[PDB]
Amino acid sequence: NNAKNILVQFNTPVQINCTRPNNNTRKSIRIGPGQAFYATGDIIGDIRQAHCNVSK
Amino acid sequence: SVLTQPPSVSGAPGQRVVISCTGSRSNIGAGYDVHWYQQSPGKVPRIIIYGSNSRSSGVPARFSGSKSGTSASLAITGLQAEDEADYYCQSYDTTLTASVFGGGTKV
Amino acid sequence: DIRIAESGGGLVQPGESLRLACEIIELGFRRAWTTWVRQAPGKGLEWVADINEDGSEKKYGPSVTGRFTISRDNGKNLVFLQMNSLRVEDTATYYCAREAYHLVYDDRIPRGNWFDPWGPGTLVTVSS
Ligand SMILES: *[C@@H]1O[C@H](CO)[C@@H](O[C@@H]2O[C@H](CO)[C@@H](O[C@@H]3O[C@H](CO[C@H]4O[C@H](CO[C@H]5O[C@H](CO)[C@@H](O)[C@H](O)[C@@H]5O)[C@@H](O)[C@H](O[C@H]5O[C@H](CO)[C@@H](O)[C@H](O)[C@@H]5O)[C@@H]4O)[C@@H](O)[C@H](O[C@H]4O[C@H](CO)[C@@H](O)[C@H](O)[C@@H]4O[C@H]4O[C@H](CO)[C@@H](O)[C@H](O)[C@@H]4O)[C@@H]3O)[C@H](O)[C@H]2NC(C)=O)[C@H](O)[C@H]1NC(C)=O
Ligand SMILES: *[C@@H]1O[C@H](CO)[C@@H](O[C@@H]2O[C@H](CO)[C@@H](O[C@@H]3O[C@H](CO[C@H]4O[C@H](CO[C@H]5O[C@H](CO)[C@@H](O)[C@H](O)[C@@H]5O)[C@@H](O)[C@H](O[C@H]5O[C@H](CO)[C@@H](O)[C@H](O)[C@@H]5O)[C@@H]4O)[C@@H](O)[C@H](O[C@H]4O[C@H](CO)[C@@H](O)[C@H](O)[C@@H]4O)[C@@H]3O)[C@H](O)[C@H]2NC(C)=O)[C@H](O)[C@H]1NC(C)=O
Ligand SMILES: *[C@@H]1O[C@H](CO)[C@@H](O[C@@H]2O[C@H](CO)[C@@H](O[C@@H]3O[C@H](CO[C@H]4O[C@H](CO)[C@@H](O)[C@H](O)[C@@H]4O)[C@@H](O)[C@H](O[C@H]4O[C@H](CO)[C@@H](O)[C@H](O)[C@@H]4O)[C@@H]3O)[C@H](O)[C@H]2NC(C)=O)[C@H](O)[C@H]1NC(C)=O
Ligand SMILES: *[C@@H]1O[C@H](CO)[C@@H](O[C@@H]2O[C@H](CO)[C@@H](O[C@@H]3O[C@H](CO)[C@@H](O)[C@H](O)[C@@H]3O)[C@H](O)[C@H]2NC(C)=O)[C@H](O)[C@H]1NC(C)=O
Ligand SMILES: *[C@@H]1O[C@H](CO)[C@@H](O[C@@H]2O[C@H](CO)[C@@H](O[C@@H]3O[C@H](CO)[C@@H](O)[C@H](O)[C@@H]3O)[C@H](O)[C@H]2NC(C)=O)[C@H](O)[C@H]1NC(C)=O
């Protein structure tokens, strides 16, 4: 049947390295009373693009 | 590892002065920035122009760097005695050295 | 923060060694590469030797190529420029700084580096 899914299960853990290389800042905004919201204050560091490496 | 820093920049007080701190394929042709350093007579130098074109605090817009291909030059307008001071550039070498320096320059 | 402490010079005779130490306190000691730059007394900028925050990597300038061994105490958080074979040829004063385009690095390759912090420097006169 073409309407199911094929579940493959490996022998070898093929690595993958994922990263988000930003130093991001947490800016707290008080939606008072007492409730506080964490926004993206800013981004510092090597502004690469978030990604993942895999041994071809 | 020397930048073509003019041994003397000149300008009457208030006049605009320009200094062409240029290098080679290796330093400004290399792709880095001309991190100039302003020095006072008798005092330690400091950062006046980083990023080759960017101002820091306390530096009037009269003072601004620029990098054009293999050339790197600074601009000062309204030059005055508080501005009649030393300037020493420095950047990266692709050939052999870390920190290429110009010869220095004062008014 | 940035509170640097230069020291370590000596009034000596040629043919010896010396220890230099910048101290910066109340901040990440192992959180910024610092470098070394001298000034012949009446001359310009002369980078000496670089270091990692950990000192894992170090490179030295041509003038003192492989003659002054730079390192640092990490846990006590001191830097130790063990200069060796001191000579009159290097009569100058010395200064200590570090580079900080860091905030946002917009590349795979850097635009260079800076020299932001300054201090008293040190006194070295190795001669008779
Ligand atoms: C997923 O995969 C991707 C791609 O596969 C990975 O991306 C890559 O990731 C690496 C590491 O994260 C990044 O490396 C960065 O490389 C740049 C460029 O480096 C240049 O210069 C090197 C040195 O050359 C000089 O020095 C020697 C010795 O004196 C001389 O011989 C030279 O001629 C020069 O004088 C040079 O080695 C580099 O060559 C590259 O290409 C060759 C090709 O032949 C390779 O062999 C090399 O191995 C190398 O790849 C290249 O020419 C560097 O700028 C970065 O180093 C900075 O950061 C280091 C971090 O440790 C630091 O130690 C360095 O000193 C350096 O910091 C410098 O700048 C700072 C300011 O910014 C200074 O303060 C500091 O003191 C120093 O001045 C870094 O190493 C790749 O950019 C990146 N590429 C891409 C496309 O993404 C990714 O990492 C993988 N991720 C995962 C999760 O899997
Ligand atoms: C993401 O970005 C932030 C910046 O946005 C960056 O922060 C730097 O982090 C380094 C760690 O590598 C800090 O260095 C350490 O600081 C320890 C004490 O930290 C306190 O004091 C620091 C000095 O500031 C004082 O004065 C200011 C004046 O206005 C005041 O605000 C401060 O509150 C404080 O009173 C201060 O910078 C620091 O706050 C920063 O640092 C923490 C990490 O420490 C960082 O996570 C925070 O986000 C914040 O930015 C904190 O208030 C200091 O004790 C320690 O020194 C010990 O170890 C070193 C090892 O080298 C020895 O040399 C030393 O002798 C001690 O044994 C260390 O130096 C550094 O101060 C921050 N800022 C700067 C400019 O460097 C983060 O690291 C980035 N990365 C991540 C993952 O978050
Ligand atoms: C995700 O990211 C992690 C970390 O970056 C990667 O893990 C690294 O994987 C590589 C690939 O094998 C490892 O590199 C190899 O390590 C071997 C064992 O380490 C010893 O030797 C090193 C020196 O290389 C010592 O520093 C260390 O203390 C150990 O004593 C080495 O034998 C390998 O060297 C051999 O091959 C190279 C060719 O690359 C030759 O140049 C060498 O001369 C030698 O013949 C190599 O160094 C690395 O060790 C791993 N990290 C760590 C921390 O160990 C993942 O692979 C990565 N995954 C993906 C998918 O990207
Ligand atoms: C798994 O799915 C497949 C479909 O991909 C099923 O096969 C299908 O079975 C039906 C009847 O069971 C077939 O319908 C009739 O089949 C006959 C003989 O093939 C044909 O002559 C008729 O015209 C009509 O099509 C259908 O054709 C057939 N399709 C395929 C692609 O084989 C299969 O039965 C499923 N598995 C199980 C265990 O049922
Ligand atoms: C998102 O955009 C807003 C603008 O709508 C940015 O906010 C403003 O950013 C500037 C610099 O980027 C800040 O300038 C400062 O202004 C004060 C007072 O005028 C001045 O004295 C300082 O010297 C400096 O010039 C300004 O404060 C800031 N405004 C607010 C309300 O925060 C914001 O930076 C942008 N977001 C990001 C992450 O960059």
φ and ψ at residue C51, rounded to 5 degrees:
-155, 155
- Give the count of alpha carbons within 13 A of B70, CB side only: 7
For C28, the token pair is 């990440």
CA distance B58 to B101: 24
Q: CB distance from C109 to chain A under 8 Å? A: no
Query: Distance from CA of residue B11 to its chain's centroid?
Result: 16
DSSP state of C76: T
Question: What would the DSSP string read from start to end of B2-50?
Answer: EEB--S-----TT--EEEE-B--TTTTTTT----EEEE-TTS--EEEEE
φ and ψ at residue C30, rounded to 5 degrees:
-90, 50
Question: Which candidate, B28, B85, B29, places its Cα nearest to that of B60?
Answer: B85
Question: What would the DSSP string read from start to end of A11-39?
Answer: SS----EEE---EEEEEEEEETTTEEEEE
CA distance C71 to C80: 5
The residue type found at C90 is: D
Query: Distance from CA of residue A5 to its chain's centroid?
Result: 26
Neighbours of A46 (CB within 10 A): 14
Q: Which residues pair with C81 in a beta bridge?
A: C20, C70
CA distance C37 to C98: 10
DSSP state of C108: S
- Specify the experimental method: cryo-EM
Q: Quick one: resolution in A? A: 4.2
Q: Do C101 and B50 touch (CB under 8 A)?
A: yes
For A26, the token pair is 């947490």
**Which residue's alpha carbon is nearest to atom 44 within ligand 2?**
C28
Q: CB distance from C118 to chain B under 8 Å? A: yes
Task: Give Cβ neighbours of residue B81 (< 8 Å, ≥ 6 apart).
Answer: B13
Q: Do B37 and C61 touch (CB under 8 A)?
A: no
Exposure b/e, B63-72, CB count within 10 A at least 16 = b: bbbebeeeeb
Ligand nearest to the CA of A52: 1
Beta carbon of C69 within 6 Å of any ligand 2 atom:
no
Q: CB distance from A29 to chain C under 8 Å? A: no
Contact B56, B50 (CB under 8 A): yes
CA-to-CA dists, residue A30 to A37, A40, B34, B88, angstroms = 6, 14, 44, 48
DSSP state of C90: G
Peptide bond preceding A33 in cis form (omega within 30 of 0): yes
